[PDB]
Amino acid sequence: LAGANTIIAIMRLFTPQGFLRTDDLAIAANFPRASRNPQTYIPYTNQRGTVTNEFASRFRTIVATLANVVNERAVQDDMQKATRSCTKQWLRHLETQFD
């Protein structure tokens, strides 16, 4: 949307990192399934590289985006100015938890 880019860009953090998967085994087993073509969306896939994790890197760009968000936040109270920078540190620590 032409004027509200930052909103959409924040909204893209919510897009899933998994994949859509046909229920192959349930089809072969002839298990009941109301959908004409059965499938479920697995939230995440297996790590494929020896070191990098696509999921954790995703979260890294998410917390980076959010850190930019908190950074761009105007504040007037001094305490709010403080919790801004602390929020930034706590994000940067969540990143490592997630990793």
Binding site: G49, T52, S57, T61, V63, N71, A82, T96
Partner: protein, 387 residues
């Protein structure tokens, strides 16, 4: 009455303390209007940076709260060796040895403190990777052959920050108006072979260049990618590609940035898939194997410091100034000190020197005595040669 002592005595103590080993930063410039401390961080491409200065708010046993009231005792209820002169106190000229021996102890500790972490992260530096699809431009191409592609998201998460660390011009967008020679100029400017796609169909000579030269095109998304190329050959097709990993070592090749020796390549190939916790476990075991020597003052600083180090990723950690606005500046030859241009995996020059010899040792055929594969077969054992 106090001014004579503050000017003629305290000043040489500030002057002498300015030369001490560990007082490693500029404190001021004299301009209140403009002095902002230089703000280095230990950034890594695969993690958040640690600012060296932060409002971490820990009082360090009350070190960081500043009572201005302290000027009152100074002006009024304190005496000085110079002011007293009507008794003449002799001035004290303290031995170097006490602070030097301390400063050295600290330097000795914190020098080696990072070593096991440094070694492992030095090995794994080439191991970071991006998923990439290789579409085939022509018939009878091996699946490894063809134009190589990666999502913009992968270029952002890995390749771009490393371009910042390597301090090179940003790779050109290719609009399909682009000549192969322009792509060449870009790859020459940024030594990693990469070009962001922008828009429009890409002409065929450029495609043969992107194929022959193994340039990794950075497509924004994989939506009908064959529409993006002038597939005059008509061999390229959306269902016809081969996905695979691409290690950072398979793209970058800077020397003190990213270990890329065929030896370490091989050693990495032998490795099991790794989580960050497995790596931390490696580091802790390497640390436990070699209990580093330290002088008693060093054990004292160690226990004062004095615990975890594990919060910080050091995958390709570097030291870089951040702008106060919060962006991480590229290394600047005229501002930042030269020693920061590459953390050399935080190893000493001599360790790097020996390390090359050791890579010659590890890669040696004579010690490659773990054997893979076997052959079950039912023969007589008549004349036993192990060979």
């Amino acid at each position: 009455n106090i001014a004579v002592a503050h000017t003629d005595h305290l000043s040489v103590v500030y002057a002498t303390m300015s030369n001490f080993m560990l007082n490693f930063t500029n404190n001021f410039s004299g301009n209140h209007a403009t002095f902002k401390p230089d703000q280095y961080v230990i950034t890594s491409p695969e993690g958040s940076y640690k600012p060296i200065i932060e409002r971490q708010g820990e009082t360090v046993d009350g070190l960081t709260i500043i009572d201005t009231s302290i000027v009152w005792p100074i002006l009024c209820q304190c005496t000085y060796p110079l002011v007293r002169q009507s008794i003449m106190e002799e001035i004290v000229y303290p031995d170097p040895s006490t602070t030097l021996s301390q400063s050295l102890s600290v330097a000795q500790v914190l020098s080696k403190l990072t070593l096991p972490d440094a070694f492992i992260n030095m090995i794994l530096s080439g191991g970071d990777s991006v998923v990439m699809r290789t579409y085939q431009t022509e018939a009878d191409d091996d699946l490894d052959e063809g134009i190589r592609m990666t999502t913009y998201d992968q270029y952002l998460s890995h390749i771009r920050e490393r371009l910042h660390i390597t301090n090179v011009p940003d790779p050109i967008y290719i609009t399909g108006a682009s000549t192969p020679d322009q792509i060449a100029a870009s790859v020459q400017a940024t030594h990693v072979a990469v070009v962001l796609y922008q828009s429009g169909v890409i002409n065929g000579p450029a495609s043969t260049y992107l194929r022959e030269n193994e340039v990794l095109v950075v497509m924004p998304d994989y939506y009908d990618v064959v529409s993006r190329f002038a597939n005059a050959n008509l061999q390229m097709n959306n269902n016809r590609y081969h996905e695979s990993v691409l290690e950072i070592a398979d793209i970058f090749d800077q020397a003190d940035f990213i270990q890329t020796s065929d030896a370490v390549r091989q050693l990495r190939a032998l490795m099991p898939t790794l989580s960050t916790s497995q790596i931390r476990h490696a580091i802790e075991r390497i640390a436990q194997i070699t209990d580093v020597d330290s002088t008693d003052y060093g054990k004292l600083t160690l226990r004062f410091l004095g615990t975890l180090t594990r919060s910080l990723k050091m995958q390709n950690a570097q030291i870089r100034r951040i702008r106060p606005d919060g962006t991480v500046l590229r290394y600047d030859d005229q501002i930042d000190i030269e020693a920061f241009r590459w953390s050399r995996y935080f190893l000493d020059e001599l360790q790097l020197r020996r390390l090359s010899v050791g890579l010659r040792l590890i890669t040696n055929p004579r010690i490659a005595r773990r054997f893979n594969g076997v052959r079950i077969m039912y023969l007589t054992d008549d004349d036993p040669d192990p060979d």
